[PDB]
From a paper:
Bacterial β-glucuronidase (GUS) proteins comprise one class of gut microbial enzymes that have been shown to reverse Phase II glucuronidation and, in doing so, cause the GI toxicity of several drugs. In an attempt to gain insight into the structural and functional diversity of GUS enzymes, we recently reported an atlas of 279 unique GUS enzymes identified from the stool sample catalogue in the Human Microbiome Project (HMP) that clustered into six structural groups based on their active site loops, Loop 1 (L1), Mini Loop 1 (mL1), Loop 2 (L2), Mini Loop 2 (mL2), Mini Loop 1,2 (mL1,2), and No Loop (NL)20. Here we present the crystal structures of the L1 GUS enzymes FpGUS, LrGUS, and RgGUS, as well as the NL Bacteroides dorei (BdGUS), and show that LrGUS and RgGUS exhibit unique active site features not previously seen in L1 GUS enzymes.
Lactobacillus rhamnosus was found to be adherent to healthy colon tissue in a patient biopsy obtained at UNC Hospitals (T. Keku, personal communication); thus, we chose to study a GUS from this bacterial species. Finally, the new L1 LrGUS was a singleton and did not group with any other GUS enzyme. These positions are generally occupied by polar or hydrophobic residues in our previously characterized L1 GUS enzymes, such as M453, T454, and S455 at the equivalent positions in FpGUS, for example. Interestingly, the L1 GUS enzymes LrGUS and RgGUS exhibited much lower kcat values (10.0 s−1 and 2.8 s−1, respectively) than the five other L1 GUS enzymes as well as Km values ~10-fold higher than that of EcGUS. LrGUS and RgGUS also demonstrated lower catalytic efficiencies than those of BfGUS and BuGUS, which are mL1 and L2 GUS enzymes, respectively. These results for LrGUS and RgGUS likely reflect their unique active site features, appearing to be electrostatically and sterically occluded from processing this small molecule glucuronide substrate. Although LrGUS does not possess the NFXAA motif, we hypothesized that the EDD motif, which places three anionic side chains into the active site, precludes the entry of neutral substrates and may explain the poor pNPG processing activity of LrGUS. The EDD motif is unique to LrGUS and was not present in the six other L1 GUS enzymes characterized in the study. Site-directed mutagenesis of the EDD motif to the corresponding neutral polar residues QNN led to a complete loss of GUS activity, suggesting that this negatively charged patch is critical for small glucuronide processing by LrGUS.
Residue numbers in the entry:
A (entry chain A), B (entry chain A): 3 to 365, 376 to 602
Write the structure that this text describes.
Amino acid sequence: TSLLYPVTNDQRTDQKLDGLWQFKFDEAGEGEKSGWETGFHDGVSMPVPASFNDFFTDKASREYTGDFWYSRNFFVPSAAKGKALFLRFDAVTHRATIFVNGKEIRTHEGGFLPFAADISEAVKYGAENTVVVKGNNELSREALPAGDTITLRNGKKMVRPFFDFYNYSGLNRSVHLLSLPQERVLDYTTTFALAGNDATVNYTVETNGDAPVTVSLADADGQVVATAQGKQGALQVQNAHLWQVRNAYLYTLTIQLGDDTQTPLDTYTDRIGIRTIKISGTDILVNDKPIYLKGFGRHEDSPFAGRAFDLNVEKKDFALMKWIGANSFRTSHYPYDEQVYKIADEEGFLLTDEVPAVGFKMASFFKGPWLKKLHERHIDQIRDLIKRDKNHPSVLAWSLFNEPDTIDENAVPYFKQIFDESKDLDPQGRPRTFTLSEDDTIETSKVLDFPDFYMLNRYPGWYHFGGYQISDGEAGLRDEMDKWQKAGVKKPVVFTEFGADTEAGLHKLPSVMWTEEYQVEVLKMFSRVFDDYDFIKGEQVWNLADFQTVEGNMRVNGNKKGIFTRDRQPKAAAFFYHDRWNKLPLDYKA
Amino acid sequence: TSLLYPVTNDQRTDQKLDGLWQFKFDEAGEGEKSGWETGFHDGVSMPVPASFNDFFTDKASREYTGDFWYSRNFFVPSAAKGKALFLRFDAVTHRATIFVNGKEIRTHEGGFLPFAADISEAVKYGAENTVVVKGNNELSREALPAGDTITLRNGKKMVRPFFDFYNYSGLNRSVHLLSLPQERVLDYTTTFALAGNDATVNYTVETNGDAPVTVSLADADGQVVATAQGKQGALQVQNAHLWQVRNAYLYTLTIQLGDDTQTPLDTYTDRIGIRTIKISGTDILVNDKPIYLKGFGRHEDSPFAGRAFDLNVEKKDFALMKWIGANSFRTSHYPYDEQVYKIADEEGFLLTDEVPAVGFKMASFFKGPWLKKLHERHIDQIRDLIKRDKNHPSVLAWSLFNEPDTIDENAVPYFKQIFDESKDLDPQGRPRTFTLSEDDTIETSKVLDFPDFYMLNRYPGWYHFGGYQISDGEAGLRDEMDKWQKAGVKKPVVFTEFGADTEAGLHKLPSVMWTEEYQVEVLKMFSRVFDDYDFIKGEQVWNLADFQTVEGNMRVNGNKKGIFTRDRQPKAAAFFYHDRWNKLPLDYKA
């Protein structure tokens, strides 16, 4: 109903409820029958935001699957009586029921997009109030991301995902207490055109009343350069400062409700970048010039917060990605905290925004009774993502699956439907795509007509033709690249996963898989291939940093394909890209 | 024809040709047409003994598969004219042709057992002579150990084994220049009986003439305690000092040819231990008392020599195995250098001697036209092994396969034949057995009647039910142990592989697979299981030290299941067994 990010001004308040909540596991499912929805203080303290998994010393807790409970007291100011009061949850992984003062307010499905609860009539204005969250982190084939939940021979419930990353759960992002006007901005949209040194922002504004609307754009020094009235309109910016890759310029948009006579009813402000995105045959055009993508390959994963957003790690990840010459990254495999995009906007990065449609395949999948509810939740999370991130200059494209099983002819109805129901959601109409796994190739894939450009996941030299065989793996990759070229490929091709697990410190001459030298050798190979084909317009290596993963005999304490360690220091492969990427211009191959 | 270890006395000489030979690859197979059999000096220097693989910086050399050539000059003393002259090769992996002064003398199949070439008429007595060895290290399903050789798309030949260890090749063990008498000892045998404080060594002596034979046994201080004449006889030792586990006592045996009147024609001396080995239902009896096996789990693998025997590593491996409380180990997966057994004899360890019958199964095998030649070489290498190691007190049992595919009913003819053709080779008639892989279980194995005791390879908690699932893996292992107990198991059971890859330095609380803590957790689990069943009479963990392996995405620079690092320092699991094994008496479970 509204996913606008909270702001602070005279009409809107926003106060974080971050800190130490109370926490309890509910393996039995008795929490509500036990009166826990009224709040409790007999559990363990738990940080918010943060995944709860890594704070326990026992594996039974770290792996817990089922119903878990967060509880906190908070204060509702007297001054807030009469406004629309909201608890906004930035992410509750994966399922939530919200209670205030013991009263059930709302539920939510999906653990990586924000939701808000209207608590206007459930609080005592001027006193302490209680908020309790009943979360669940089970997996099934009916929810994103896809997986199964099993019971061990000893009764305990355990998750077995269809994806790589670990099942980090809980209150993974901030909780806001909001005060909004009764008549307020709900949504707005931006699209851009260029003409000479002039540009045109084309906006619209969604409201829940009939009061007049007034939009104004100011430059980075605060000077106003365009005004307009009405819920639709066009701002004319003379001699505009365009938003450029690794060279951002952000204008401030200000939406204001109310006619020239009354007290202002609502103010909303955001920062936009004036730039356009077109797929012209086989080029990716930003502001009508061709670009070349270089980057990662990312996860929201840190030692102490787990899946939860941590601003220190994020600014550090960004410091590194600029140092290394990169200009893009894909939010694999789920929407990130909204701060990630604002930094991307300020730093002129291009993001591929991915919905958690991962694990749609087994080691078939589109041939099961789970699709019907799965699809409900899939296209709903697509809608919420595009509604949340629409206005960011830095979002280049939407990714609607990661490694779905496109070999089966039954994937084709489902893709048909997903791609029709998302056709007209993004006002900028940016390209919609998805990643093709190693098994989904020009020869074998059945959904190659759908994407606006191709995103390829290939692992020669790691999952196939490892070691001394790498040369045959390079030859096979060029085989497939020859067949794309033969098939007269007209859309762009971007490599979005490739690489090699590497244990920082393992050295060998000559190399063996898992050493720092082999990783450089593998990345050099992929580079040689990428440079001999013109439809290839981007390299996004997997992965930026070592991230945590389910336990397995192939997981040396998590994934290790990262250019940097989980602590964000470089492996030797860091310096290879630092050399290569800072020498490829932004228009490489044009 | 004779595999006796060389000795030095007035009838027999023995001089090592170890050092730097010349070396060349022969990818083309032109070496003989090019005159290389006459010796060469235009190649690269290569140590002997040692695997050649790890001395090259390029992967193409390290991985080379095909014909390779060793060349050396050596001096034949004038004084040796008239004796039987021999080049004895302790191991040439895997195939050899021997040339002396350009003349082809002999070939050999099998890369882990010694062979001798009679060069009595191919040398110039009193000058320098040339020895050239043409080796090959290809694999096929017709040779032990089993594997395949492939060609890459670029022409290069590459091995793909059916086993784990790396294909270390070349002159992996010493080369001796021998001077033997014209009439000489070829073989001898020992068997033992006990009666009160007295014992009886029952010997026989194989000779290539009719001259009289004279055998005498002396104690550790050099006192003679028994003499006998004739090629068969029985030495009566009063108040014998028995050879005890971790408590050896070795008598010196001296065989002498010639009657009381002539100059001695030949002397041969060896050290034996007076002890007996019986499988009594479900007990393993050494000297009629029950023992409990604890140990490894070994390879001949070191950083600088590769597969080649290195006495420093061997004494260090033995220092550690005594420190840790162990008393046994299995020479997986091939006969070791003969020095390993002499140290075992001096340290009172019990060895399971294994022939390189590994890889008899694919990821079927006994259903192929390769068995006929495979079996030729299999039973021949069995014959050579038992002939070489017969007389060691420390060899407890023979292992005739490692992880053969016993699920197919076609394995049964081949086992039938192998087990009949080895029935009467070991004079002591020690137990013959083999290892059963994870897939070969009480439910599924078709060769359970053959072995004299059962050797089990089980990997719960690693290749199955890893991580948080370990509890279900423990339950499944007890399932199988319950079904053995149900089936009324009458032969002993020994666990001979189990464990977990562990990267020294990886710590986590709670644990994850690959950390030092998880390894201890896994080893504790297996211990709990072993202690609840009486037919279980031994634990040999895999592995003693991290050893090198083929490149693969599951091989973090070789195998890592070792209790010690490849440099022979302890991981945390070292101290767990140091505690446990030094508290289990030698008669645990009796």
